[PDB]
Every structure is written in structure tokens, then in C-alpha cells.
Write a protein that binds this ligand. Structure first.
Ligand SMILES: Cc1ncc(COP(=O)(O)O)c(C=O)c1O
Lengths: 121, 350
């Protein structure tokens, strides 16, 4: 339904709230899509089955321009099942980015899934 | 030593930190790394005291956010000791750093480059390379490095050096000696593409407990005297602050579990500090914390599935209200209202 498109991104849409399908046509990479969902400022990216395709973070980093710059999101949350098998390495890597683990019960988030929250500045 | 002040407060989870251990370890540092200038990765522990002593000695500061250069600028540290080395940098952060005199900014991709170009084009860029287990990949590969080195020119941006970061869990020194080798090759293509490079940053990852340093530092010193003889900085973290802190947790629940087939008493203690509060390690780096006093399993305040501090340890009975201790809880155990907690720290400077 043609939400946004620039030189590096192609986000088509799926239905309320607003779900987004952001896809990175990066300057030399393979195809990396992120099924996200924007709900009241904050955007919630779902994390693929793993392992991750070779493109991110260069893709995911673009996924933070937008949405900080286009969706004007104050919060971007990631989520993956728990499970999985690399929950550690996952938790660890995204923490290298300004992320942090979210204590269950938060007002901005099910129990089968592990969340992480990155806030903008 | 300070391993008593705990008791002086025993009469709600709290820290005590041997603020001397911070210093002796810095002393140990420049005795083991005389060539390297340490830049504290403040994200490891952004407590003002920890920083204020460190700043007052002679350490630079690897910052990674807006609030972090705040903390360190407010302590009157000159922006010539600040290096902005966040893996993924937001744009507004590039700008804030620009407007505030910080010049050294890392990068490892063209994506990071464009961002730097339109926010702080007059920055002193340091190309972070990828030393050889994590999801995404961090640091440039030896090939893409060159392409970044040219692109930087084709953009007219000053690249002044290279960096790497082996990080924790490096189970072999021959990884350090290799990066410095690759760090040479990159210095070349830079000097070859036409850059007056002079800054080698070797990142951080060196241990902060005795469970070794000089072992890693001793394979380094001959490697630097080799590839880089006549500036070298680092980004340590876990090192400085690990062995300084000791966490005091209070048992806030008790349960006995039996498991009878056809005869096995086991205890479960719940404390007021969890894996979503302080013990990020055990689901991050899969830690193995041993508890100290003054068969069971220790669980956290959140009744969650993996809020499990220790899964199985031989321990005498209690009851509730008792405290337990964990040493070397200084690295990545402090942060806040997302996401809320804030404990209280007792600094003991002899
Ligand atoms: C660029 C950089 N420097 C330093 C650190 C922290 O170093 P240390 O492992 O000693 O805590 C981090 C994360 O590990 C980092 O991303």
C-alpha cells in the first residue's frame, strides 16, 4: 500500500493498529525484511527465526534512521521467542546497540516471548 | 577490608564498592600497559563516583550516548579524552557530540558513514575493523575497510585511525595479536588512500576478576612494539570495575520441594534482585555466580521462568530475611525508569 520508500528502504503495509513491513534494498546487500508494528509512537520489530541473514546491522541500523526520523518513534522494541537457542547471543548482540532487557509486566508489551527495548534520545 | 561494611549495614538490595580496587587496577594497568592509554567504557558502570576517581587519575572515556558524554563533560573532562564509540549511532547523537567538542567517532560501515557525513562532517573518524560468538557482525572486513577508506575521501571526511574490539570471552590471546596485525594493513591502505593515520584503538575486553590479565597483556606488548612502534588508546570496561563491587541480596521468599519417586529435600530462595534487574549476565553471557554467606537454587523477585540467579548449589537452610553475597558484581550490573530499579552504592575509599 506504499508507506515509505527511499534509496535504501522499501516498507509496504499489511488492519488496525498499523503494521509495517520494512525492507532494506541496501547499497550492496541481500534482501532483509523486518515485520514490524507501530502502535502509539513506539514501534515493535519482530526478530526472524535465526540465524540472521548477512546484511544487518547495516539494514537494522537503517531501520533506526526511519523510524526515528520518519515514524518519529520514541521507543523501538524487539521480540523473539523463548526458547530460542541463541537467546543469549541475541540478548547480547542487541545490547551492544543501545538496547536493554525489559522486565515482564511492563505496560508496553504475552509470556512466551522475550522482549528488548531501545529508547531514542 | 571493605568486606565488612556489608555487615555494618546488616541490621533491600545494596552495593558496596572498594573504590581503591579501582585505583590499584589502574596502577596495575599502566604498569602492564605503559604504551596504551585507557579510555573507560562508561556504559559498563556509569556511577559518578567510579567515573570521578577515574577521570581524576588520567583515563579517557569511551562514551556511547548523549547522557554519557553529559556525565563525563559535567566532571570537567576535556573533550580531548572523549571518544564516541557506539556501534550504531543515531543522528541526533552525532550532532550533540559535534556541538560539544567531541571529535573521535568510530565507524565500520557506509551506513554509519552517511550519518556522520550530514551531522558531523568535520569529525575525526576511526575505522573500527572486525576482529574474528555474536549475531550480526561488528567491524569492517579487510576488504570493505578499503572501500570505506576511499569513500571517506570521496566524501572528504578525515579518517585518523583504526579500532577493534575482541570483547569478553576471548579464550585465546592469538586473537589480539591478529587484530593489531590487521590494524597495520588498514593503516597502510589509509596512508595509501592518503590519510595521516596515527591512532590505534584496541578496544576492550580484558577481565576484571581473577577467574588472566597480564597473560593477555604480555602477548600484546611484543605485538605493539612490532607493528606499531612510534598513538595507542583502549576501551576497557569489565577490567576496572568488576572486582570492586559486591552485591548484597535479601531472601524474600522460601519454598521446599521434595520430588518423591516411589526422598530428596531441596530449597528455593527468592531474593529482591533479579536477572532483569542486576543479573543481566546469566542470560547475556551465561554467567555462573557463586553465592556467599556471612541443596538449593536462588530465584529473582519477578516470578518469571528464567529469573534464576543460581540453578543448583549446596547451601544450609535459612529462613527468609537473610542476606547473601555475590562478589565481582561491578561490571554490567548497574543502570533508568524503563526498566526501573536503582539500588544504592556504598563507596569505601581507604
Ligand atoms: C566499542 C566498545 N568498547 C568497549 C566495550 C566494553 O568493553 P568491555 O568488554 O571491557 O566491558 C564495548 C562492548 O563490549 C564496546 O562495544
Amino acid at each position: 500500500n506504499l508507506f515509505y520508500s527511499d534509496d535504501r528502504l522499501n516498507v509496504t503495509e499489511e488492519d488496525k493498529t498499523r503494521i509495517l513491513n520494512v525492507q532494506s534494498r541496501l547499497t550492496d546487500a541481500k534482501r532483509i525484511n523486518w515485520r514490524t508494528v507501530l502502535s502509539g509512537g513506539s514501534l515493535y520489530i519482530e526478530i526472524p527465526g535465526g540465524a540472521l541473514p548477512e546484511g544487518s546491522k547495516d539494514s537494522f541500523a537503517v531501520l533506526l534512521e526511519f523510524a526515528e526520523e520518519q515514524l518519529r518513534a520514541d521507543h523501538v522494541f524487539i521480540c523473539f521467542h523463548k526458547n530460542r537457542e541463541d537467546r543469549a547471543a541475541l540478548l547480547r548482540t542487541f545490547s551492544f546497540l543501545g538496547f536493554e532487557i525489559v522486565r515482564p509486566g511492563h505496560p508496553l508489551v504475552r509470556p512466551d516471548a522475550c522482549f528488548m527495548a531501545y529508547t531514542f534520545e | 577490608t571493605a568486606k565488612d561494611i556489608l555487615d555494618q549495614k546488616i541490621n533491600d538490595a545494596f552495593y558496596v564498592a572498594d573504590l581503591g580496587d579501582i585505583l590499584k587496577k589502574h596502577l596495575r594497568w599502566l604498569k602492564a600497559l605503559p604504551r596504551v592509554t585507557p579510555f573507560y567504557a562508561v556504559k559498563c558502570n556509569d556511577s559518578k563516583a567510579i567515573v570521578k576517581t577515574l577521570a581524576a587519575t588520567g583515563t579517557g572515556f569511551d562514551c556511547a550516548s548523549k547522557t554519557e558524554i553529559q556525565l563525563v563533560q559535567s566532571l570537567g573532562v576535556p573533550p580531548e579524552r572523549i571518544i564516541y564509540a557506539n556501534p550504531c549511532k543515531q543522528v541526533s547523537q552525532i550532532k550533540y557530540a559535534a556541538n560539544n567538542g567531541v571529535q573521535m567517532m568510530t565507524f565500520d560501515s557506509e551506513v554509519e558513514l552517511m550519518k556522520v557525513a550530514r551531522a558531523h562532517p568535520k569529525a575525526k573518524l576511526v575505522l573500527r575493523i572486525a576482529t574474528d560468538r555474536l549475531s550480526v557482525k561488528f567491524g569492517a572486513t579487510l576488504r570493505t575497510s578499503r572501500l570505506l577508506l576511499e569513500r571517506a575521501k570521496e566524501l572528504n571526511i578525515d579518517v585518523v585511525g583504526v579500532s577493534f574490539h575482541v570483547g569478553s570471552g576471548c579464550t585465546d590471546p592469538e586473537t589480539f595479536v591478529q587484530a593489531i596485525s590487521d590494524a597495520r594493513c588498514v593503516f597502510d591502505m589509509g596512508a595509501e588512500v592518503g590519510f595521516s593515520m596515527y591512532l590505534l584503538d584496541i578496544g576492550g575486553g580484558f577481565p576484571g576478576s581473577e577467574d588472566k590479565f597480564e597473560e593477555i597483556t604480555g602477548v600484546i606488548n611484543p605485538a605493539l612494539d612490532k607493528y606499531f612502534p612510534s598513538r595507542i588508546i583502549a576501551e576497557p570496561g569489565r577490567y576496572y570495575v568488576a572486582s570492586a563491587f559486591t552485591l548484597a541480596v535479601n531472601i524474600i521468599a522460601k519454598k521446599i520441594v521434595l520430588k518423591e519417586q516411589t526422598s530428596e529435600q531441596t530449597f528455593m530462595y527468592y531474593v529482591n534482585d533479579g536477572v532483569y534487574g542486576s543479573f543481566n549476565c546469566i542470560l547475556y553471557d551465561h554467567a555462573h555466580v557463586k553465592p556467599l554467606l556471612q541443596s538449593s537454587s536462588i530465584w529473582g523477585p519477578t516470578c518469571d521462568g528464567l529469573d534464576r540467579i543460581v540453578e543448583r548449589c549446596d547451601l544450609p537452610e535459612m529462613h527468609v530475611g537473610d542476606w547473601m553475597l555475590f562478589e565481582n558484581m561491578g561490571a554490567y550490573t548497574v543502570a533508568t525508569f524503563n526498566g526501573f530499579q536503582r539500588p544504592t552504592i556504598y563507596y569505601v575509599m581507604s
